[PDB]
């Protein structure tokens, strides 16, 4: 609603603290974000499959649905433009670089390929589109020619 | 540099006094359109019959935002309404008939193009009825091939307009709604006028694909008001019409005439059918598969006893038995079967006779066979005379009985040809190789393989073989075609081999084993006859044609190269080219084919089953030896009729509704009249 | 599906086989009178091929693979007719069998296998999860030691 | 209140009122196409059914066998089936948590603890549900 | 020639009074409808149905 | 491309075929009728293309 949203901040359920970012990110609203994001949010991160401790051990013995889906909607926030807009330095590598971590948990989560692998590609669009925002050769050269190595 | 761009072809520009009141009527603004028509009136200032860039002029503007106000605005002021009628009624706005009713040059529509006309290209029963109700006609389309007519024969003044003209003419007689509503049975017509659309579909080849889409329009429209039936005793009425005995399905007939198969493949016009099939046996689909499997069994097994019954005591419910068309079938296979049986058995020793004996006497087994082939060729003559030559020549399989039944007789005249003529006996070998009984033997076995291979036009009854057999029908045309292909690049290497080798051929007494040929365990002389050169490129694509027989015993090695060349080429392009081809041919058939597959199946299976519908029938060794009524018949039909076509119109209005997007003329509308009211209000309130 | 196809080539097999044993059974030899005491479609020189059905059977099988030589359809007698007959009907059913009926698989098997790709996984995790569940049961020891 | 007759069973040819279908047999089948067409409704199934789930699996069985039974017509009584089977899918695919998940997948209309419903859909070749992706992971894990 | 076109099944036909009131409800003038409906009670000059 | 034969689409395909088979029969006499005086009727039949 966007006006909604402002009055309502004027005055499932993964989570609560980060899921109207975690919402907001799956629409892909640049608007509702940049309005949540004003207050600082920290997205929690999600651990990796590996894990073994009660940090994901319990949860995964508790429910292992939850968890599996939390994670997902914790990737699927990540990955929206809108979201590696406003919150990365450089949004190509990062797409370039959550694509590869998109794709990796294709093969771990094999229950849920499609779904991670829908994000890799929705990152990897993200970055061709951004490059075909690019109009001059010294834009082109900037962009192709830039590390983030010192 | 830089090109200058000009309008080189301009037109009259609109006086912005003008431009304001086309303005206006686009907005709905109806007092600043009233002001100006008075004004013009009186200072004259505005065309009001004015005309926009794209040359539509006030009238047509409202006309598109359907302003029936404005309308009759404008109408009741003096504005020019040429062509009006016919963008009303292509933007299908009822409510314009007020165009109808007033009464008193760049157009999109073509100089032919009547009222009536595009009603019927739009299909609006409703547009189309209002304008019935007036009298109102469409000219006759002159019959195909009407070179008599002169006029028709006078096409050379503007052969486009008068193939649009055509064209124009059909796509009204063929819309679903005038059919329905000007037709007295609007489902002959349909299944006529389809038949004739394909038809000029072929003479016109240009145009094709249009006559073609009306008639596809003609049979889904037939098949669409059968669906409508919501009683079997509608069906009945409808399927058993005679246009003029009845209760002979007589419509289901017209529209195999007419190859209407979507009509017929229609599921109650099956189930109807079906019931009359399997008279006799209640039930016979909840029957177990077992269980019907022995009833099968059993019936067959009886066919001598149902038959002989029959013939005998026609009245006996043993007689009446063999009647039922599912019994026939099952007993006319039975019979067949048999006879492929006795077959079998005529060459298995059974009563083999000396191989020796020259013209010998019919063995049993012979005797026995040749009843069911008397028989079989006086089915066909039943057949052909029923029928007509022309109908038993549609059947291609019938062709195939034709070739079997002739090579049949043929094989018994020449058996007579031997007998008499040939009363010695001879050691085989010495035997000429025209001997009448070595020719009647290989006819015989020619005969053999068309008889079994027949068999396959039983697949058709059966739900998993039939659909099948039907592809395969449609994927043989193509390679028929292919073989066509084929031939020629069989012919053209066929003449080169031939006339490099011809002068290398050998007598046979000097090759192994006096044998000459590629059919020798030695292959020789391959190419150097024609005859020969065609039969070993042949083999060749099976690859039973070794390479050696390309050299030649002088050894010439350019020749033998150039040779080896030839053959080469002509097995990459046979097989790895031509053949490869073919798959792909296939292929993209099948799909095709496979999506109409059921429909293509049924069809096919209601012409088996009608076939056995008949009164005569018996298997083929056993052939041994008031105007009232009509009056009510038509009365009834058209009852149906009138109840099928208002169900019909009212399921296509319905489906249009709610499976039609919204476009953006809609768009424009509904600003329109939101604007429209604003401007009222405004006025009032202000 | 191959199976429903298999019947139909099954169909024409038998034809062609009743054809051709019944132009060639009048020149059957004996295995004696044949070299190296052989007769067959399986000896070093393939011969009475088309003598009788269950030989013509399988001569007519082999072809399709293309084990079957042309050589066959000779009669020692050399009666020339004859042999252009057999030889057309051998030659018909391999056009028939391999031209035709073989090249129509192919586009009857590309058919299916693009619908049934279409499924592919719900196919295979169900078939699968049978089969996981057979052993999810308790009542399981090897096939060796199955039995006490 | 409401009530849609109970189609009589598959072949019932005992009950004289199938054998109505001497008479307007149309009529006959259509009635009862569209009988099933209501009883497959995703809602109908949601508002009435104690156990939606296994009211679908079952309908959709008794479709499909209908289906075959009634050649004609066959293309409507699969498509009514298919719609049962991806109604039962959707209904899983709702769960959230793996304690719903296991409730629903190890309970025995009526030992337990056995995955029961599963045994039924694979029974019924309810292959969508069965190869569900929260599904399958359960299944992994044991 | 030409060929006469004619409604084949006639139905009968809305008398004037009776297309206006059908037109009013495909407009959703609820007075024009009204008016009809009440002189109609008393004119009996359509048939509401 | 088919002057000279009006109605050819309308000619059924045996008669098609029949009037094909004569002119190709007697596409020598045509050849030369054209050779030794285009303007004959018989040099005019030539010149149609089909
Ligand atoms: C429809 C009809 C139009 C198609 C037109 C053309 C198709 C291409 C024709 C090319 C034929 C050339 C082959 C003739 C020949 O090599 O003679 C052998 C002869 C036999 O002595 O050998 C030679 O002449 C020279 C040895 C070189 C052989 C290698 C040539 C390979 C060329 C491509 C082969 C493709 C095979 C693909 C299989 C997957
Ligand atoms: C399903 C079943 C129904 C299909 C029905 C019909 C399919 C068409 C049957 C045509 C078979 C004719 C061939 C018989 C024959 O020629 O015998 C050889 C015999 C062997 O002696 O030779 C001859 O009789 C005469 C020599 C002419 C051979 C050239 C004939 C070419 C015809 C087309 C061949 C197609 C090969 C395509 C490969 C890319
Ligand atoms: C495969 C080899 C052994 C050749 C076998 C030859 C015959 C024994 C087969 C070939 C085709 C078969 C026929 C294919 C078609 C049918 C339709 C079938 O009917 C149905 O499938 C549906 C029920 C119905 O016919 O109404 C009855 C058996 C019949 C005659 C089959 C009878 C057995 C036939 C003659
Ligand atoms: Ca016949």
Redesign the pocket.
């Given at each position: 609603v966007v006006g909604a949203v402002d009055i309502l901040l004027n005055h499932y359920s993964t989570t609560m603290d980060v899921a109207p970012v975690i919402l907001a990110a799956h629409r892909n609203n640049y608007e509702i974000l940049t309005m949540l994001l004003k207050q600082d949010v920290s997205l929690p991160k999600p651990h990796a499959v590996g894990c073994e401790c009660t940090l994901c051990s319990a949860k995964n013995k508790k429910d292992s649905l939850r968890h599996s889906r939390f994670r997902l909607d914790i990737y699927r926030c990540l990955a929206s433009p809108a979201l590696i807009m406003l919150t990365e330095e450089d949004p190509i590598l990062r797409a370039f670089e959550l694509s590869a971590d998109l794709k990796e948990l294709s093969l771990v989560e094999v229950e849920f390929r499609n779904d991670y692998e829908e994000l890799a590609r929705q990152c990897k669009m993200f970055a061709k589109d951004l490059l075909a925002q690019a109009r001059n050769s010294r834009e082109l050269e900037v962009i192709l020619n830039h590390t983030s190595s010192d | 540099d830089r090109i200058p761009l000009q309008i080189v072809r301009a037109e009259t520009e609109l006086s912005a006094e003008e431009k304001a009141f086309l303005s206006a009527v686009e907005k709905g603004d109806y007092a600043t359109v009233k002001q100006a028509l008075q004004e013009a009136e009186i200072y004259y200032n505005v065309n009001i019959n004015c005309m926009d860039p794209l040359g539509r002029s006030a009238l047509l503007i409202a006309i598109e935002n359907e302003n029936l106000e404005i309308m009759e605005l404008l109408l009741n002021h003096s504005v020019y309404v040429g062509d009006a009628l016919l963008y009303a009624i292509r933007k299908e706005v009822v409510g314009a008939v007020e165009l109808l009713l007033s009464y008193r040059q760049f157009s999109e529509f073509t100089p032919d193009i009547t009222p009536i006309m595009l009603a019927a290209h739009t299909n609006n029963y409703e547009i189309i009825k209002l304008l019935v109700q007036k009298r109102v006609t469409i000219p006759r389309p002159h019959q195909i091939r009407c070179n008599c007519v002169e006029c028709v024969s006078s096409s050379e003044v503007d052969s486009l307009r008068h193939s649009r003209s055509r064209l124009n003419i059909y796509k009204a007689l063929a819309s679903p709604s005038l059919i329905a509503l000007s037709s007295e049975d609007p489902i002959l017509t349909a299944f006529r006028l389809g038949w004739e659309l394909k038809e000029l579909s072929k003479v016109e080849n240009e145009f094709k694909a249009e006559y073609e889409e009306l008639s596809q329009q003609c049979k889904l429209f037939a098949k669409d008001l059968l669906d409508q039936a919501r009683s079997s005793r509608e069906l009945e009425i409808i399927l058993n019409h005679r246009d003029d005995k009845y209760h002979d399905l007589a419509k289901l007939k017209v529209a195999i005439k007419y190859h209407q198969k979507e009509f017929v493949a229609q599921p109650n016009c099956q189930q109807l059918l079906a019931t009359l099939w399997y008279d006799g046996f209640p039930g016979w689909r909840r029957k177990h598969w077992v269980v019907k499997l022995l009833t099968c069994m059993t019936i067959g097994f009886l066919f001598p006893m149902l038959s002989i019954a029959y013939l005998i005591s026609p009245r006996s419910n043993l007689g009446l038995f063999i009647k039922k068309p599912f019994i026939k079938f099952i007993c006319h296979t039975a019979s067949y079967l048999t006879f492929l049986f006795m077959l079998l058995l005529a060459s298995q020793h059974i009563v083999r006779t000396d191989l020796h004996v020259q013209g010998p006497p019919p063995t049993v087994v012979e005797w026995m066979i040749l009843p069911w082939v008397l028989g079989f060729i006086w089915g066909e003559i039943k057949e052909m005379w029923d029928g007509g030559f022309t109908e038993y020549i549609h059947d291609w399989w019938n062709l195939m009985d034709f070739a079997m039944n002739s090579l049949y007789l043929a094989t018994i005249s020449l058996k007579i040809v031997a007998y008499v003529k040939y009363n010695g006996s001879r050691p085989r070998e010495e035997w000429e190789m025209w001997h009448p009984t070595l020719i009647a033997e290989a006819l015989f076995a020619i005969s053999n393989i068309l008889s079994s291979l027949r068999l396959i036009s039983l697949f058709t009854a059966n739900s998993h073989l039939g659909p099948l057999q039907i592809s395969l029908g449609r994927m043989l045309l193509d390679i028929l075609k292919f073989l066509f292909?084929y031939c020629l690049?069989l012919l053209a290497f066929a003449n080169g081999l031939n006339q490099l080798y011809f002068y290398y051929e050998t007598r046979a007494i000097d090759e192994p084993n006096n044998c000459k040929g590629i059919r020798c365990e030695k292959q020789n002389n391959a190419f150097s006859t024609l005859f020969e050169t065609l039969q070993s490129l042949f083999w060749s694509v099976f690859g039973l044609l070794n390479l050696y027989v390309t050299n030649v015993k002088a050894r010439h090695e350019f020749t033998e190269?150039v040779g080896?060349?030839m053959f080469?080429?002509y097995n990459?392009?046979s097989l790895?080219?031509?053949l490869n081809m073919l798959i792909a041919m296939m292929n993209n058939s099948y799909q095709l084919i496979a999506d109409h597959a059921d429909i293509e199946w049924k069809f096919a299976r209601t012409k088996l089953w009608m076939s056995y519908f008949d009164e005569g029938g018996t298997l083929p060794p056993p052939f041994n030896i008031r105007h009232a009524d009509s009056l009510i018949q038509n009365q009834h039909y058209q009852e149906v009729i009138r109840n099928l076509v208002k169900r019909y119109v009212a399921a296509m209005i319905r489906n249009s509704k709610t499976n039609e997007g919204l476009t953006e003329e809609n768009f424009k509308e509904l600003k329109q009249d939101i604007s429209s009211f604003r401007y009222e209000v405004l006025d009032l309130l202000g």
């Open positions: - | 292909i690049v190269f080896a060349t080469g080429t990459v392009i790895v080219v031509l």
